[PDB]
Amino acid sequence: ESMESHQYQTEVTRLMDIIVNSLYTQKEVFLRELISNAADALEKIRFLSLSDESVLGEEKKLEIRISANKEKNILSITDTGIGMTKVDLINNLGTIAKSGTSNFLEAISKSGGDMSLIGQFGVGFYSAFLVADKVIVYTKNNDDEQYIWESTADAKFTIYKDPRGATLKRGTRISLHLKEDATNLLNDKKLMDLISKYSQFIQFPIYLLHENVYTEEVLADIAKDMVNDPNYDSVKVEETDDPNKKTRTVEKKVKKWTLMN
Ligand SMILES: CCNC(=O)c1cc2c(-c3cc(OCCN(CC)CC)c(Cl)cc3Cl)nc(N)nc2s1
Numbered sequence: 001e002s003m004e005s006h007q008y009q010t011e012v013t014r015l016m017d018i019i020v021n022s023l024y025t026q027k028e029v030f031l032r033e034l035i036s037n038a039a040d041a042l043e044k045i046r047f048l049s050l051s052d053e054s055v056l057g058e059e060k061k062l063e064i065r066i067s068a069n070k071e072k073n074i075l076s077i078t079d080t081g082i083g084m085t086k087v088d089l090i091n092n093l094g095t096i097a098k099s100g101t102s103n104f105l106e107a108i109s110k111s112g113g114d115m116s117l118i119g120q121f122g123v124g125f126y127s128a129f130l131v132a133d134k135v136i137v138y139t140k141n142n143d144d145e146q147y148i149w150e151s152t153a154d155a156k157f158t159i160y161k162d163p164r165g166a167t168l169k170r171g172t173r174i175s176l177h178l179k180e181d182a183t184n185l186l187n188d189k190k191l192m193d194l195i196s197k198y199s200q201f202i203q204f205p206i207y208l209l210h211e212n213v214y215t216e217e218v219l220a221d222i223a224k225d226m227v228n229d230p231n232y233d234s235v236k237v238e239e240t241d242d243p244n245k246k247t248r249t250v251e252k253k254v255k256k257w258t259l260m261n
Contacts, residue, residue, distance in 0.1 A: 012155035014102035033124030041081025067209035085144035132176035214252040223248035
């Protein structure tokens with residue numbers, strides 16, 4: 001059941017209308033905003049770890065992880081930053097609702113200005129709706145349990161405890177359920193370009209999960225047993241009609257993490 005106020009639904013509908021009509025040709029900028037949010041959250045927990053190192057108890061990693069799921073049409077930006085308690089999340093939503101950021105952006109757009117301040121105005125998250133019709137946020141902060149915040153393009157949201165528990169240990173995962181028009185964002189070449197572009201001044205490692213293909217010649221009888229290997233996402237054995245051939249070219253596809261900065 002939706003938990004938005006009419007004020008939240010109005011403010012966010014205005015933000016979305018302005019952001020969309022102002023950035024319809026630069027849809028890709030959502031990634032700059034999400035990476036920016038993630039670095040800010042990582043800086044918060046990094047700063048606290050200087051006085052009390054025990055804050056990193058649940059997860060020593062301090063990084064950003066980008067991964068696409070081509071079958072489910074989902075893009076995820078995950079970080080091991082501070083994360084949010086239910087209190088931090090509802091405060092953040094109340095901040096968005098009470099502020100008149102849409103007044104500032106309406107003014108910027110009417111004046112012929114750009115959306116380069118959406119990040120400084122703390123509304124950069126809503127740029128995700130340029131490419132997605134549904135955004136599912138999973139978050140975990142040391143002081144609370146893991147929560148799920150599920151938002152839609154109609155400015156409606158719902159918050160509930162994660163049935164699977166603290167799968168994140170510490171940090172936040174932004175899962176974008178992409179629109180049919182945003183398929184290009186699941187490709188390794190596009191993501192690599194976008195991440196190299198938007199990582200310029202990010203003091204934390206950014207990792208991309210991309211396809212690695214392994215090719216070798218194998219004896220036909222073993223080529224059939226290669227298919228079963230669970231260490232690979234998929235195994236493609238070459239199809240041959242000639243019973244002459246005693247060997248088969250085998251392509252083993254699997255995704256590994258590469259440091260992008
Ligand atoms: C312990 C406190 N932790 C937090 O507050 C965290 C937030 C976030 C956000 C994040 C930040 C957002 O807005 C930034 C501006 N707000 C706060 C000034 C005012 C609305 C939004 Cl609209 C959405 C998300 Cl998901 N993103 C990420 N990856 N991590 C965190 S950890």
